[PDB]
Symmetry: C2
Subunit: 335 residues, 2 copies
C-alpha cells in the first residue's frame, strides 16, 4: 500500500509533493477562480527565459501542444526533419501532423546522421531519451547541424546542468545553435504545461500564427503562482540532484556487476534494461510488482525492455532488491 | 475599475466565481499535488454522460484537443466533412490537420446543405455559433444527415435545454442521430477542459488510437473534485438561466426598436450587431470602452460585427446604455 517502490513516475526530484505551494494555489484560485481568461504567465515566462538564458519563453498547456504549434506552423510537407529512431512518439505525432518528411537515424549514431544529413534541415532530439535514458551529445550534434537544433528537455530539465537548467545548459549551447528548446514541466518540475524557449523572431512568429494553439488550450491561471515557486524549488534542490546521481551511479555499477545489459550507460534517471525475451519481461514485471516494486515494460526492435525511472528518494536497498530479482530470473534463460 | 460592464466573457451563468468550490480545490491539491498522473476522472465522466444522457464520456484537456483527437483519428484525406461557413476556427484547424476535405455551406442554410450533401459524410456544427449566436435547428439537420452529426456545445451547454444540458438535449436528438457531441467546459461551465460524449464503439476506438492526445495532455487531477461540484452548480442555477434569457430577450427587443441589425435573432447569449463599416466599428468599441463597456469586434465577409456576450448578472440598464450609444453613432452614418 505505502511500502510501494515506484520506479515508473517521472518525479525525479520528488518535487510534486513540495510543501511550500499550498498558499500559492489557494491565492491563485481566490484571484482567478476555477476557469480561464496574465500578469503571472508573463512573469513566469520572464523568469523561465532568465533561468534557461534564452531571449524568449512562451508558456503552453502541454508538451504536445508546444510541439504541434512548432511543427505545424513553422514546417510543411516541403521540409524534412531529421530525428533519432527512438524519438518520443508524441514528437513524431506533432511532426506527422505538420506533414514534414521525417528522416531517421539509428539511436545516437551521430555519424550516420552525418551520412544522410542534407546540410539544411532542422533536427529534433531529446536531451535525455524517454526510451533509453541516453544523453544526446548536443555539442557534437551542433557541429554537424549548426543553427538547426530543436531539443526536448522533458527528461534533462531539473536533472542535468547547473542547478538543473538542463541539457542545452550543460553542453553550453547557445540559441545560435539551438533556436528552439521545449521544456515540459510534467516531470522533474512536478507541474503541468510546457515552456518553449526561442529567439524573438520565432517567438513573435509563433505568437501571431499559433494563437489558437496557445490561447484556446491555456491552463487555468490559478496555477501560475504555484509554478513560479516551483521554478525556484527546482533551482534550489541541488541535494536532490546529488541523491539522484548517487542512485544512478549505484544502478549502473550493480548492472555491470550482475552483467545486466543497459540500452545506455549514460548518467540519467531512466535506466532501460535489455531483455532478449518479451515473455521473461512480463514475468519480471509481475514478479517485481508482487514485491511492491513497479517498473515499466516496452518492446520495440523485433527485444524487450524493463524501464526504471529513478528518483532522488529511492535507496540503494530498493535498487539492489529489484536487480537481484531480475538477475536471478535472467540466469535461468542461460539454458 | 470595478464598474466594468463586460460583454465579452463567456461566463454566461456567472459560475466561474462559484463560492462552493474552494474545499474541492484544496482537497484535490492535498491528494494529487500540483502535477499529473483517476477515481475522479471516471467519476466525472460517469456523471457527465448521465447528465447529457449518452453512453460514454471521455474527458479531454481542451476543446481543441478533443477536436483534434476526433478528426485526426476517425478521418483521413479520403473523407469529406460538411460544415457551416462560420464554424469556429478551432474546429477548422482540427479538421485541416486531419486532412479531410471540407465542404462548406452558407450560414444556417440547411437547404443549401441539402443541395450539396453527398448522402454519406459527417457534418460538423455548433449548437450556438460563437460568431453569430445563431441556434442550429438540430432536428431539421438530423432529417438531412441522419446518423452523421458532430455537434460542439461550447455555447449551448448550461444555456439551452433542460437544466442547461444543451442543444442536443433541447432538440431531443439521440446518439443514434448525433454520434459525437463535444462539451468544452470553459464557458458557461466556468471551468477548463472538454468532454466528448459518444457511443461505446467510438469511445473505445478513441481511447485505443488517441491515447497520446488524451493522456500526454491531461489536466492536473487536483481540479476534478471541483469539476464534479461545478456539474451540479450548472445543473442547479435555473434562476441564472432565466435571468440570462430575460437579458437576451431585452437585447433583441431593444435592437428591434432602434433598427439595429442582428446577424441572428435567435435566443442565445451571443448577440452580434451588424455594421456595414469597419471603421465605425473600431470607433464604437473605443467609445463603449471609454464608458466602461467592453465588447468584442470582428470582420469577415468583405461588413463588421460588434459582438456582445450576455450573462445572467447583466442588467437592462447596461444593455440599454450600450445600444443607445451604438444607435446614436449609426444615425450619423445615415448620411
Amino acid at each position: 500500500d505505502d511500502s510501494i517502490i515506484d520506479f515508473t513516475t517521472s518525479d525525479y526530484l520528488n518535487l510534486s509533493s513540495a510543501h511550500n505551494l499550498k498558499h500559492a494555489i489557494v491565492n491563485g484560485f481566490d484571484k482567478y477562480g476555477f476557469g480561464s481568461k496574465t500578469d503571472e504567465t508573463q512573469q513566469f515566462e520572464h523568469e523561465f527565459a532568465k533561468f534557461i538564458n534564452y531571449p524568449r519563453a512562451i508558456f503552453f498547456s502541454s508538451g504536445f501542444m508546444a510541439n504541434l504549434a512548432i511543427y505545424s506552423t513553422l514546417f510543411s510537407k516541403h521540409d524534412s526533419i531529421f530525428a533519432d529512431k527512438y524519438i518520443h512518439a508524441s514528437i513524431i505525432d506533432g511532426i506527422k501532423l505538420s506533414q514534414a518528411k521525417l528522416r531517421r537515424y539509428k539511436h545516437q549514431q551521430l555519424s550516420q546522421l552525418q551520412d544522410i544529413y542534407d546540410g539544411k534541415s532542422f533536427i529534433t532530439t531529446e536531451g535525455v531519451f524517454s526510451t533509453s535514458g541516453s544523453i544526446t551529445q548536443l555539442d557534437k550534434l551542433a557541429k554537424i547541424t549548426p543553427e538547426k537544433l530543436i531539443v526536448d528537455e522533458a527528461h534533462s530539465f531539473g536533472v542535468l546542468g547547473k542547478n538543473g537548467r538542463g541539457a542545452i545548459n550543460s553542453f553550453r549551447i547557445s540559441y545560435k545553435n539551438c533556436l528552439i528548446c521545449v521544456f515540459p514541466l510534467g516531470k522533474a518540475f512536478g507541474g503541468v504545461g510546457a515552456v518553449v524557449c526561442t529567439t524573438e523572431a520565432i517567438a513573435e512568429y509563433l505568437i501571431q500564427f499559433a494563437r489558437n494553439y496557445i490561447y484556446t488550450t491555456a491552463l487555468p491561471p490559478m496555477i501560475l503562482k504555484a509554478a513560479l515557486i516551483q521554478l525556484k524549488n527546482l533551482e534550489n534542490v541541488n541535494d536532490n540532484r546529488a541523491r539522484l546521481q548517487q542512485n544512478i551511479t549505484f544502478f549502473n555499477e550493480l548492472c555491470d556487476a550482475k552483467d545486466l545489459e543497459l540500452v545506455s550507460k549514460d548518467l540519467s534517471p531512466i535506466r532501460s534494461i535489455q531483455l532478449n525475451n518479451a515473455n521473461l519481461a512480463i514475468r519480471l514485471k509481475d514478479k517485481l510488482f508482487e514485491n511492491k516494486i513497479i517498473v515499466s515494460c516496452f518492446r520495440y526492435p523485433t527485444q524487450a525492455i524493463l524501464r526504471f525511472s529513478l528518483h532522488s528518494n529511492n535507496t540503494f536497498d530498493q535498487i539492489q532488491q529489484a536487480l537481484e530479482i531480475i538477475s536471478k530470473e535472467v540466469k535461468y534463460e542461460y539454458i
